[PDB]
């Protein structure tokens, strides 16, 4: 399937994301209000992808319109990007199982990890700024890109575009914070440490939220939700619990004092021996 | 040297009371008592750990480690 993410206005952007979510996922029974929910990605076979056409970088104009992202459906990872003018798919090294018919596939040496992309980009996500102007610059960098190895500017472009497409699909918090940059004021979105932490905890969150049954809160590592509106204002789409669902063990949650904890988090602060014995036993 | 940077694939308490972690496909042991709960907590929560040591072959010892959230 192919979808469009239209950056023309906040309305067009949010409507684009909501349409994608409706097609590829199904709401959780216990975390759903109206048509706004935390949804679980519908099962698809490994290697299935959908395409995202980027539009509206220049508001409501049919220009800057040659960029397409290829997104692995089961995990929402960007597998690479397509220059539709040259009909070329630049594919990250960790996605050799994703085949796109009808294009020239350039298999890259660069992997898609945030660690690699931030190193090549010389740009950390914490504090990274995204504006309409920098998305236009990112677009031009990707259209100028050629070869099998990511450059600095292509990597900066991918960091920005993944944040405002796939990570926004996952997290309503990122959708909400970024969309302000699309307005006539043209302000700047600054990705915060909390935004980054959300993205890093996506798999853990995905394993925990299907167990939610109206507890007073949810705790997953560094992430805290104190009520259902905090959950819904933060998270939009989760994995179908995929290897990212499990770190170790086999217990998703423990309920402690009417709070749903990731069992691993509780285990990781309850594994201390007697403090006097710890400190004297050097 | 930064020998390894990755998630803990397994941990092991050894008969000589040292503690081993497997990171980046290589095994590293430490005799630092303080590190045993910390390394297990990292394994439990999927922390990325950085093992630093003067030799980086599997089976090397370490006494320095960084605990990252990413």
């Amino acid at each position: 399937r192919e979808f469009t993410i239209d950056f023309s206005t906040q309305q067009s952007y949010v409507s684009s994301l909501n349409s994608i979510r409706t097609e590829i996922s199904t709401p959780l029974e216990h975390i759903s209000q109206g048509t706004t929910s935390v949804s679980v990605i519908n099962h698809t076979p490994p290697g299935s992808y959908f395409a995202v056409d980027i539009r509206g970088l220049d508001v409501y104009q049919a220009r800057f319109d040659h960029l397409r992202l290829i997104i692995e459906q089961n995990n929402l990872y960007v597998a690479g990007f397509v220059n539709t003018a040259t009909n070329t798919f630049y594919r990250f090294s960790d996605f050799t199982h994703i085949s796109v018919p009808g294009v020239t596939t350039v298999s890259m040496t660069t992997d898609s990890s945030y660690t690699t992309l931030q190193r090549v980009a010389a740009l950390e996500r914490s504090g990274m700024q995204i504006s309409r102007h920098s998305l236009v610059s990112s677009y031009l960098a990707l259209m100028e890109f050629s070869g099998n190895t990511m450059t600095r500017d292509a990597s900066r472009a991918v960091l920005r575009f993944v944040t405002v497409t796939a990570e926004a699909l996952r997290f309503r918090q990122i959708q909400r914070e970024f969309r302000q940059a699309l307005s006539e004021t043209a302000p700047v979105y600054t990705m915060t440490p909390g935004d980054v932490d959300l993205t890093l905890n996506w798999g853990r969150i995905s394993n925990v939220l299907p167990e939610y049954r109206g507890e007073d809160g949810v705790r997953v590592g560094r992430i805290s939700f104190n009520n259902i509106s905090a959950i819904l204002g933060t998270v939009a789409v989760i994995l179908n619990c995929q290897p990212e669902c499990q770190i170790t063990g086999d217990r998703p949650v423990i309920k402690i004092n009417n709070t749903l904890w990731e069992s691993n988090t509780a285990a990781a602060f309850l594994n201390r021996k007697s403090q006097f014995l710890y400190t004297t036993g050097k | 040297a930064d020998c390894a940077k990755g998630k803990i694939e397994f941990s092991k308490y050894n008969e000589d009371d040292t503690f081993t972690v497997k990171v980046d496909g290589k095994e590293y042991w430490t005799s630092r008592w303080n590190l045993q709960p910390l390394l297990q907590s990292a394994q439990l929560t999927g922390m990325t750990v950085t093992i630093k040591s003067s030799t980086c072959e599997s089976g090397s010892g370490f006494a320095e480690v960084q605990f990252n959230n990413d």
Partner: peptide
């Protein structure tokens, strides 16, 4: 595995 984009 560290987080993929």
């Amino acid at each position: 595995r560290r987080r993929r984009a």
